């Protein structure tokens, strides 16, 4: 198994270090918005 006489391994291992942290972002989300509608108006008694 390729070990020394006292059992120490004779090969140096590698691990392929994990790939960095992860950045997380937020964004504004906008939705369609309408406006009000108008109705016919009443005729007042006073002048303009």
């Amino acid at each position: 198994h390729n070990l020394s006489i006292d059992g120490q391994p004779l090969s140096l291992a590698i691990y392929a270090e994990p790939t960095d942290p992860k950045a997380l972002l937020t964004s504004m989300v906008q939705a369609s918005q309408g406006g009000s509608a108008v109705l016919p108006g009443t005729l007042s008694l006073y002048r303009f």
Binding site: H1, N2, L10, S11
Partner: protein, 48 residues
């Protein structure tokens, strides 16, 4: 193991050395005792 390496000539040398040791030490039967008395096998203490 798959970790240990060698060469073709080195492995052939090791195989023939093992075979000679087994034949000389009477471990494998029917070994030709007349052949086992040559100068090479008589000096096998340094030719091994």
């Amino acid at each position: 193991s798959s970790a240990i390496k060698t060469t073709r000539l080195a492995e052939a040398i090791a195989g023939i050395q093992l075979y000679i040791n087994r034949a000389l030490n009477r471990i494998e039967p029917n070994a030709r005792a007349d052949v086992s008395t040559r100068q090479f096998f008589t000096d096998w203490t340094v030719n091994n």
